[PDB]
Specification:
The structure is a homodimer.
Chain A (H helix, E strand, L loop, with lengths): L4 E4 L3 H12 L4 E4 L11 E4 L3 E4 L4 E2 L4 H9 L4 E3 L5 E6 L2 E5 L9 H18 L13 H5 L3 H8 L3 H15 L8 H9 L4 H5 L8 E3 L4 H11 L3 E2 L4 E5 L5 E5 L4 E4 L1 E4 L10 E3 L4 H6 L8 E7 L10 E7 L8 E4 L9 E7 L1 H6 L4 H16 L9 E6 L18 H5 L10 E3 L12 H18 L27 H5 L3 H6 L2
Parallel strand pairs in A: 1-2, 1-14, 2-10, 7-17, 11-15, 14-21
Antiparallel strand pairs in A: 3-4, 5-9, 6-9, 7-8, 11-12, 12-13, 16-19, 16-20, 17-18, 18-19
Helix pairs in contact in A: 1-9, 1-14, 2-14, 3-7, 5-6
The complex binds a molecule of 2 linked components (FA8-3PL) (2 copies), N-dodecyl-N,N-dimethyl-3-ammonio-1-propanesulfonate (2 copies) and 2-(2-benzofuranyl)-2-imidazoline (XCG) (2 copies).
GO biological process, one term (chain B): substantia nigra development
EC number (chain B): 1.4.3.21, 1.4.3.4
Protein name (chain B): Amine oxidase [flavin-containing] B
Amino acid sequence: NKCDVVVVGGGISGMAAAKLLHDSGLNVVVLEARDRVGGRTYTLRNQKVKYVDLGGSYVGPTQNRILRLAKELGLETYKVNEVERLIHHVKGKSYPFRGPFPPVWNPITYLDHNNFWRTMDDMGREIPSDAPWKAPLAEEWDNMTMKELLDKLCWTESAKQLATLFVNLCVTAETHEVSALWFLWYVKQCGGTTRIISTTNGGQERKFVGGSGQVSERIMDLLGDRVKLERPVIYIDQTRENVLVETLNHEMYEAKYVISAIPPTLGMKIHFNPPLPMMRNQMITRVPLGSVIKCIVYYKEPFWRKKDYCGTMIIDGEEAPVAYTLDDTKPEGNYAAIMGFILAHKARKLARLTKEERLKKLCELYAKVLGSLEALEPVHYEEKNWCEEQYSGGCYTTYFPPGILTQYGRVLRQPVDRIYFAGTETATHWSGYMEGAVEAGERAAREILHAMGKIPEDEIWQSEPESVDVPAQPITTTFLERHLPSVPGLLRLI
Amino acid sequence: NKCDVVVVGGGISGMAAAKLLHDSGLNVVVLEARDRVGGRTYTLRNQKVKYVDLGGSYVGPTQNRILRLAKELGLETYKVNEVERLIHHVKGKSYPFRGPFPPVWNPITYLDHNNFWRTMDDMGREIPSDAPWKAPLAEEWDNMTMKELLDKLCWTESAKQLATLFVNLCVTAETHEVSALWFLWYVKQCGGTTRIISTTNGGQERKFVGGSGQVSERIMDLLGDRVKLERPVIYIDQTRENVLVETLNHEMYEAKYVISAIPPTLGMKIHFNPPLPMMRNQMITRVPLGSVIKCIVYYKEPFWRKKDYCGTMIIDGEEAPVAYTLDDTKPEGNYAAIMGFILAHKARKLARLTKEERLKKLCELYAKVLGSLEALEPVHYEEKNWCEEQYSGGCYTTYFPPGILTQYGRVLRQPVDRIYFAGTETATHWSGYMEGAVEAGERAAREILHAMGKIPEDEIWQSEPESVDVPAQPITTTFLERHLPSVPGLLRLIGLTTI
Ligand SMILES: *Cc1cc2c(cc1C)N[C@]1([C@H](CC=O)c3ccccc3)C(=O)NC(=O)N=C1N2C[C@H](O)[C@H](O)[C@H](O)COP(=O)(O)OP(=O)(O)OC[C@H]1O[C@@H](n2cnc3c(N)ncnc32)[C@H](O)[C@@H]1O
Ligand SMILES: *Cc1cc2c(cc1C)N[C@]1([C@H](CC=O)c3ccccc3)C(=O)NC(=O)N=C1N2C[C@H](O)[C@H](O)[C@H](O)COP(=O)(O)OP(=O)(O)OC[C@H]1O[C@@H](n2cnc3c(N)ncnc32)[C@H](O)[C@@H]1O
Ligand SMILES: CCCCCCCCCCCC[N+](C)(C)CCCS(=O)(=O)O
Ligand SMILES: CCCCCCCCCCCC[N+](C)(C)CCCS(=O)(=O)O
Ligand SMILES: c1ccc2oc(-c3ncc[nH]3)cc2c1
Ligand SMILES: c1ccc2oc(-c3ncc[nH]3)cc2c1
């Protein structure tokens, strides 16, 4: 089976790469392991839900590539509900609020919370988006976990508990599991603490009407039989004139170049001839993905709105199975629902239960947090545990344990002879997201066009015009936010 | 191709498992990815060296399973040279010594060093060998790195520097890369700090005459054509009555049971039907192996012995490419040589050089440490960087980063339907070593014999008689070693007295 380029993986990144090469007139083939496209996106349809995203779902301002590609494919977005108040549930009680962060009243606690977010952003400003290993303190920050950084920075338990929730929600991993350098890079490359965590004007702003799975599905529609489902790649041989790619179902493909568009560690499922260079050989064993169950509970009405709650809950404490929720009701106001994530160690702990047992735990939690018996009467339930997936390895994305990013980070996007590397993990802006999958797929495709003499080197990386539909507003701070002292700062001054 | 049991992997563990099963009367096949058996053991033979171990090589007292297996195969051991003095090189200078650790004269520094080793072993005694996640403080210890633990325990930089060399040499990883719970388990399950690090009476005491690769080679000889070389396994299907195992070169094997005798993360190279359970699916992405280049420099004579140095060097400092060496001269006294390890980040950093460039840096280092110009006159050089191996992933063994051993540790040797797990990583005594490979291969084989109804349950785990050729001396302490205070203990005493 001969072609110009074989793309390994039919997620957003693989599809985005294959579309760009196809549009330029090359013959492309996509080899997809699953019986479906979309990868870490997956939209389920049935009569009870109409459609529901069980994988990645949210898009927001500054994510211009995914918004442009989806629009071209005929998709529209709608705004996640944030009309009414958010809730922070702390020590068994609900506190309603508005804004990026829940209010803090104790003056010492206030200084400590303010300093924490401000310091994460100050640190990020020294970390290059395209080369975090070049931060002036790269080794110092990479050799400690986020747990150790929080222990140093947070003088109050209140700030440490909220910081921990923040880490667990952003990267589906425990603070002690991940490098401080890598985590600080991850926040900075999504535009900072406010942008990453916000609904209005942030990464949770919007969802696609009909589901995000439609991105990969609609590219597969364009490409037709160029997409081969149930073709897990098992072997890549670069010792001859053309590259040879073999699948598990005993097919052989021959191409001038390959794009690897799978999570980095899933490169281990492929046997290489000749062997990979030593730094990549070891890198792909050092880069796990996080752990999460995404759970959606359906109700007759969006009853929380009647109490002036929008459906967003930030829920602290070990006993709560879900630490974060958003309203998942359709833009038409029907199929009322709450989406929640079971994060990191809780995904491992609660996976032992039945689906019915998890539904009961969630409904009882939401009844307490929303202060409503209506939460105890679900009409339907859907969930997906991404820890189970052989061809994802987890969700949302790959995290770096201490020491790995500085030692192996340079390897991620370095070509290996005629194999180029896409996948959201290789992006420089919203890596981890659907936005990063588009950036990395289109960049890896343009590296091949450049290697073919079709475009100049300065066209490999390309800027994206801002979406007219989803424009970004500036992120601002107040004089007091910028200048109030930290807790040890107020002590040095006393 | 039909059989009772397919063993995936022909290193020591898979070879020990296959031998046990074969001896019990079962039909076994070994599917080995490489064109050779032995895996993380590899004995090179050529005219310049005669033979030389480029992978695992040392055995010692308390490693009774590997000693028994090797003896039965007709192999002999000899003692690594420790006749003359050891050297500790720190801050640019060499200090000769004898004993498990260089002597410390400053009384405050002495308290801190004594307390450090003592405390590592005290903590280890809280950790069950067969279940480290059951330690009372397992979560607390697993949620910090070894670097954080050294920062807390060591009240002198001298102790922290030495402990850092200790961690790097024991597990070919950095202190900040590894879980404190996992590292404390690893040391305890090798018999403790003295036993793991010693030559005489420890893990470095002996080598096999002719090389350790003979263990795997001689078992292949016993098994004949049951060992299939250049058969990398790509696919295991358990949806039917018999297990189906497919190889890369397009062959199919059918068996009642399978033993996976490969490093845990190399399980990712196999596509599973049905998919693995979620805990194992994630576990095999969380367990990297360490990084090392093993380097042997050959000389006309063992010239260091004439200066009353045995060849053992503990070398501190970033600029030193090699942090630990042993005399590698043949027991006959010829093919004089120094073996050195390039460890952890230095294996990555120095892999960029040529073989000739690395030889030059090693000779220049040895010349300074030994105060000997003769070190600049090598006659031959061999090396192996284990980081480059597709079918090993690194050496010596698998390490666990913070948080992993408590969350996923119980999965490591849990059977998946009809797949059982061997490999040194699943051992409970000298896991990471050739000893642990034998323990795990024989244990997994006996799990299958029990599943077939051939042996009762209490025979799955079996004790090993002590070697009569290499018996173990106990590790002892003195009254003062046991009861002298730590540095903060002493400060507490001072505070109390002066109150
Ligand atoms: C799973 C999951 C993902 C995301 C979210 C939630 C879940 C449960 N959430 C999103 C955000 C992540 C933040 O960090 C988010 C969370 C919370 C609030 C706001 C936002 C989300 O809502 N928005 C968003 O943009 N991204 C989210 N999540 C991550 C994205 O889903 C993810 O970034 C992209 O989908 C990744 O795309 P790709 O890089 O294209 O990678 P895959 O989807 O994994 O595709 C790889 C395909 O390759 C196939 N494969 C594997 N191995 C193969 C072999 N050997 N041979 C052939 N094919 C192979 C595999 O099957 C895939 O199809
Ligand atoms: C590499 C290396 C290993 C060891 C040492 C040094 C090096 C450079 N040193 C040893 C000590 C380790 C201490 O922690 C030590 C160090 C310093 C001072 C004293 C002692 C040593 O000297 N003694 C010792 O006992 N062990 C050492 N090292 C570790 C051992 O080499 C290792 O423990 C065993 O060899 C492991 O045996 P196995 O569990 O059987 O595992 P492998 O050897 O890796 O065999 C697996 C085989 O599987 C094949 N494979 C892989 N993937 C396959 C697929 N998909 N299909 C089929 N076959 C597959 C692979 O090719 C292997 O042959
Ligand atoms: C004359 C009185 C002097 C008292 C000295 C006050 C020091 C008290 C220690 C409290 C530790 C608080 N945390 C946040 C855990 C560590 C801070 C990290 S760091 O100290 O900035 O490194
Ligand atoms: C007479 C008492 C006065 C003491 C007051 C001085 C403060 C001492 C701080 C030194 C830190 C030493 N290290 C080893 C880095 C950390 C130890 C961790 S732990 O404190 O033992 O938990
Ligand atoms: C810690 C953990 C979760 C969090 O969610 C927010 C938030 N959501 C929408 C506006 N701010 C802020 C926040 C902080
Ligand atoms: C830290 C690093 C390496 C080391 O080697 C020893 C040792 N070797 C032989 C007897 N003791 C002790 C020791 C401590």
